[PDB]
Symmetry: D3
Subunit: 126 residues, 6 copies
């Protein structure tokens, strides 16, 4: 299952842009969250994307001009990230697969946590 | 503030062991979570540690025999991680500092989520 | 087009095994070539795969327990390499895409150039 | 022998310029090839240089302000590359050594395959 | 003991500036040395700092806008370097610890060896 | 001149062995030093070699089955290190060049400083 030890969610992007994570399907009416994480790197950025406990849906898009791929764990495969909420990269909690899912209906209700959600660019010195 | 873009929480460890994260101070009666994340690496492991939305306290220890340090964002400083819950590394949500805090009183109430909490070892091919 | 500057053919493998390249579709009645390139590396091996002038077909497989993907140029996508000649990774000279092609009919007549064909494991010190 | 597994031909350059490969000594009247591969990198560029099957001579030069050295396999030594066709770096197919050879007489007959010959700059994300 | 095999003195800096080493406590009235080593790197610079035989005191500071930390051997801890002689980073020959020590009274008597003392920025191609 | 900023002395070795530094030519009858610095790395070790103030001669050898080369500053060239004191790599203080020199006559009078002289293996985490 993605997010389990051994199946960690990583992203690789080129050029500047924002990776946005939508945290939703919260148990007992927990508020859904949307937050954009910017990079200004002109080259490659590597990222770790986390879940939040008590949520069952995680969707993300890349809005930069350059490529963006995900990798699961130490797997070799890198596959394109969604570029709009109508074709988001989405993970159902417990799933081993990233699917394409339209989550346009979820976004308007989410609270904004730009630069404070659970996706992180790795720096030059790690 | 730690966990914000630019102040991401990274760990560096040497040798095998477990990085254990206690997610607590939940809003809305949310159950606290404790989960150990194992590495079998004999060398250096780099890690990304995430918070979970709707929690206000994040405490972690390294249970392995080798060294463990944290780094904030692209900062150069690397400082020892706590090695027992009475001297845990702890972040109060909104703080820019990792403090040493006794959270022994929090641990027994937390639900166990070993290999499924918000701390991730980076692989050899990222 | 693959093999042009900017669209170089790279491979990434995990663990020991052999990458085999089949050079065929020769102009001027050139004979077909097959050559296995082994690695004993336990971890990630990166590779450059070249064409030969005057040939129009390039087919390759990975034979190993571990994963194998190709990457084109500096692009972020990494996609699985074929694991038998009946579903080889194949490039038609001029194409920008790697296809799956059965080339089992080419193999028996190809001249064997094991450890002397146009696929190279990159070393630890480049 | 250079181009065999363990004796792969690598180039290291500094700054922008062009690496040109001359593939010649073709069997069965195969036409000679000359092709320039440019880099605009301001720093170090690493390169893999391939032979083509059915050719017995491979000669290369670097045209740039900055240094250029070759390395054989995972060997440590790095030695200067020729900077003009009258003192080209040259490999006789079967040789374990890079020699200096004047191939000015070979150049005019070669077909031009600029940006489509068997020398490759390695990307930032391999 | 710092400067023994396994306890080598390394520095990590960000941005341009000068690392200055003061070599003092010379046996048999050997002359004290002070020398500034500049970097113009915009990003991270890694450094090796050596002692000189027959000296018993080594003190250093970083003058630059960016961060500077030292690391002992392959240890994970990185700790801030002194930014003035009144709170220099200092090593007593035979000590395993870097201390803060005011050496302002040592500086004026030391002979100037700017760009020729025993502290070295590592290059991009090592 | 080697050891000046921009012309730092770096070594690259493969496999386990010892790099031995002989510090001699001491002003005012300063005692000569010989010290072996071991590596147990199975692959590449990178090294920084320092002079000591008040000495005018620096000679080094590599004892191991694998290769050893030196590199000056950010230069691309890497050239073999001497493998015995009769064919030592030697630097005359102020020279821009490493020469081969027999220093067997200097060795017997040098004091032993094994694992405590001015040559440093770089760690896995720098
Ligand atoms: C039409 C064709 O096959 N072109 C190839 C060319 O054949 C000609 C033939 O058409 C007629 O003109 O007689 C000529 C005698 O002077 C010659 O035989 O011959 C080239 C030499 O074999 C060949 O190029 C070689 O093979 C290619 C696959 C490639 O490796 C080249 O780098 C190599 O020199 C011609 O193939 C075409 O070359 C162009 C080069 O721009 C393209 O790559 C095409 O995709 C190739 O078909
Ligand atoms: C001696 C020679 O020319 N051998 C090359 C071989 O020629 C024979 C020809 O002599 C006669 O026997 O007809 C045969 C057809 O029935 C064949 O044409 O042809 C090989 C190709 O089929 C050729 O190998 C090619 O060219 C090489 C330069 C190299 O690129 C090979 O990978 C490639 O397949 C023979 O050349 C020798 O190949 C051996 C292979 O081990 C060595 O590399 C020698 O150095 C080559 O001269
Ligand atoms: C059936 C159900 O809704 N269970 C709730 C927990 O969610 C499940 O947790 C299990 C734990 O092993 C498993 O992940 C299932 O997939 C979840 O449906 C819930 O656990 C909390 O929320 C989860 C989404 C996950 O984040 C977990 O780590 C977290 O503790 C608990 C909360 O106390 O309540 C259960 O009713
Ligand atoms: C006063 C209060 O309790 N506000 C609640 C939110 O917590 C604060 O959120 C802001 C968000 O900008 C900020 O992080 C403060 O530090 C929080 O105290 C709460 O937000 C949710 O829980 C937070 C701990 C944080 O994880 C946030 O991302 C998450 O959305 C909201 C939503 O449930 O409830 C508010 O009452
Ligand atoms: C003063 C003394 O007792 N010994 C002198 C040496 O200094 C010591 O060297 C030993 C070597 O095992 C050890 O490092 C002690 O900490 C030193 O105090 C001195 O050695 C020279 O200078 C040292 C500072 C050190 O750099 C060493 O490598 C160098 O050879 C010698 C020669 O001057 O004199 C002894 O009397
Ligand atoms: C003999 C002379 O001209 N000067 C002596 C110093 O040696 C020279 O130092 C200069 C500095 O630019 C230069 O390196 C010359 O090539 C040296 O010959 C000598 O300096 C001490 O020993 C040196 C070998 C060097 O290590 C230097 O950094 C160190 O301080 C001093 C002794 O303090 O005496 C001068 O007369």
């Amino acid at each position: 299952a993605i997010f389990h030890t051994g199946s960690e969610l990583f992203i690789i992007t080129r050029g500047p842009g924002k990776l946005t994570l939508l945290t939703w399907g919260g148990l007992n009416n927990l508020r859904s969250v949307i937050g954009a994480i910017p990079t200004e790197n002109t080259g490659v950025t590597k990222w770790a994307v986390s879940f939040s406990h008590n949520y069952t849906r995680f969707s993300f898009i890349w809005e930069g001009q350059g490529e963006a791929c995900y990798q699961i764990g130490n797997g070799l495969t890198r596959s394109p990230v969604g570029r709009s909420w109508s074709s988001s990269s989405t993970i159902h909690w417990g799933s081993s697969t990233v699917i394409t899912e339209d989550v346009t209906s979820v976004v308007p209700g989410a609270v904004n946590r730009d630069k404070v959600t659970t996706a992180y660019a790795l720096p030059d010195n790690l």
